[PDB]
């Protein structure tokens, strides 16, 4: 009886094994655009992915992780609200059964078809496992997906998914360039929060981009053909792998833009 997104093991259940699920800085949240204040002290975000080395794509039974070589400072996130250097370790998505839902964060209660999380760890903690025990351990770059035109830079991810259908399957995924997943603008909202899956650790500076990327119906349909289950178990389609918005509590969302 492990955690997941079903009726019996979904986000409403998680607090029994992970009491921090009801903590003071949980993610995701609704971003109220009329309450988020412009902060002129916020520096521009620095996304340096030119030397990023992708290695592998993994179905972990909850999502798929594209994993990077984080053994040196190649692909890093700096600037914006961050102190120091955060190393890219993996990206994954959250998505829905239909285009009207799937994002974790919401904008004035609007749900997007999906949400990309680029996960980075603070190098002053030496390793990812140490970093998740610190309030400033992780920086997650959040990007909304809407359905329209295809994203060229996503198609290499879409075409490998046939080969990692079921939990525990992985495939070689070298030379993927995550710069292909960004929008034009790096305008963002920022707030302190958590991982959005167990163990729901309160270690994340959230950086959520204002501009969504467009992906095609055909691109998101191929995300929805993945399986939560392992090989030769009953098919459960990998859909609605999103946690809903959590109480903001004593937190301010800052905007990088006027
Ligand atoms: O990838 C995600 C999903 C997610 N969290 N926040 N947004 N998405 N979480 C990390 C899961 C994890 C944390 C610590 C140790 C082992 C594994
Ligand atoms: Zn995520």
DSSP string of 107-144, one letter each residue: ETTBPPSEEEEEEEEEGGGSSHHHHTTSTTSEEEEEEE
Domains belonging to the chain, first-starting first, are 2-258 (3.10.200.10)
Largest CA distance in the chain: 55
Measure the CA–CA gap between 195 and 226, rounded to whole angstroms.
Answer: 22
Q: Is the CB of 132 under 6 A from ligand 1?
A: yes
Do the beta carbons of residue 70 and residue 103 sit within 8 Å? no
Ligand 1 atom 6, closest CA: 195
For residue 13, say whether it is annotated as part of any ligand binding site. Answer: no
Q: Is the CB of 196 under 6 A from ligand 1?
A: yes
Is the previous residue joined to 28 through a cis bond, with omega within 30 degrees of 0? yes
Q: Quote the distance between the C-alpha of residue 3 and its chain's center.
A: 18
Do the beta carbons of residue 4 and residue 10 sit within 8 Å? yes
Cα–ligand 1 centroid distance for 153 (angstroms): 24
**Helix/strand/coil for 160:** helix
Q: Element (H or E) spanning 47, and its range?
A: strand 45-48
Ligand nearest to C-alpha 60? 1
- Whose tokens are 């178990």? That residue is 233
Q: Which residues of 105-118 are buried (b: 16+ CB within 10 A; e: fewer)?
A: bbbeeebbbbbbbb
Measure the CA–CA gap between 62 and 94, rounded to whole angstroms.
Answer: 9
Q: Which residues contact residue 249 at a Cβ distance below 8 angstroms, ignoring those fewer than 6 apart?
A: 24, 25
Cα–ligand 1 centroid distance for 120 (angstroms): 11
Tokens linked to 257: 């833009």
Total residues belonging to the chain: 258
> Which parts of 119-215 fold into alpha helices (H)?
128-131, 155-160
Cα–Cα distances (Å) from 93 to 77, 144, 145, in that order, read 19, 10, 9
Do the beta carbons of residue 99 and residue 220 sit within 8 Å? yes
Ligand nearest to C-alpha 140? 1
Among candidate residues 1, 13, 62, 120, the one labeled active-site is 62
Tokens linked to 195: 């991982």
- The DSSP code for 223 is H
Task: Report the DSSP beta bridge partners of residue 140.
Answer: 119, 206
**Alpha carbon distance, N-terminus to C-terminus of the chain:** 47
Helices (H) and strands (E) in the chain, counts: 3, 15
Measure the CA–CA gap between 137 and 131, rounded to whole angstroms.
Answer: 4
**Helix/strand/coil for 179:** helix
Strands 37-38 and 76-79: unpaired
The neighbour count for residue 3, using CB atoms within 10 Å, is 19
Q: Nearest-CA neighbor of 196 among 252, 135, 131, 246? A: 246
Q: Is the CB of 246 under 6 A from ligand 1?
A: no
To 5 degrees, how large is the angle CA 32–CA 244–CA 229?
150
Quick check: is 1 catalytic?
A: no
Burial of 170 from C-beta contacts in 10 A (0-12 / 13-18 / 19+): middle
Tokens linked to 240: 């609605």
Q: How was this structure determined?
A: X-ray
């Amino acid at each position: 009886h492990h955690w997941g997104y079903g009726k019996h093991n979904g986000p409403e259940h998680w607090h029994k094994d992970f009491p921090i699920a009801k903590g003071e800085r949980q993610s995701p949240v609704d971003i109220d655009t009329h309450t988020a204040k412009y902060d002129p002290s916020l520096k521009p975000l620095s996304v340096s992915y030119d030397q990023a080395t992708s290695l592998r794509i993994l179905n972990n039974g909850h999502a798929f992780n594209v994993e990077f070589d984080d053994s040196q400072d190649k692909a890093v996130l700096k600037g914006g609200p961050l102190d120091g250097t955060y190393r890219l370790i993996q990206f994954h998505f959250h998505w829905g059964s239909l285009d009207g839902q799937g994002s974790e964060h919401t904008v004035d209660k609007k749900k997007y078809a999906a949400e990309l999380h680029l996960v980075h760890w603070n190098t002053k903690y030496g390793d990812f496992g140490k970093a998740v025990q610190q309030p400033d351990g992780l920086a997650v770059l959040g990007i909304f997906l809407k359905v329209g035109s295809a994203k060229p830079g996503l198609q290499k991810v879409v075409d490998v998914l046939d080969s990692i259908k079921t939990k525990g399957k992985s495939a070689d995924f070298t030379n993927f360039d995550p710069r292909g997943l960004l929008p034009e603008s790096l305008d963002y909202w920022t707030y302190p929060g958590s991982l959005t899956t167990p163990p729901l650790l309160e270690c994340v500076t959230w950086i959520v981009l204002k501009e969504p990327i467009s992906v095609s119906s055909e691109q998101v349909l191929k995300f929805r053909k993945l399986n939560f289950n392992g090989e030769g178990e009953p098919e459960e389609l990998m859909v609605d792998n999103w946690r809903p918005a959590q109480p903001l509590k004593n937190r301010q969302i800052k905007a990088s833009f006027k």
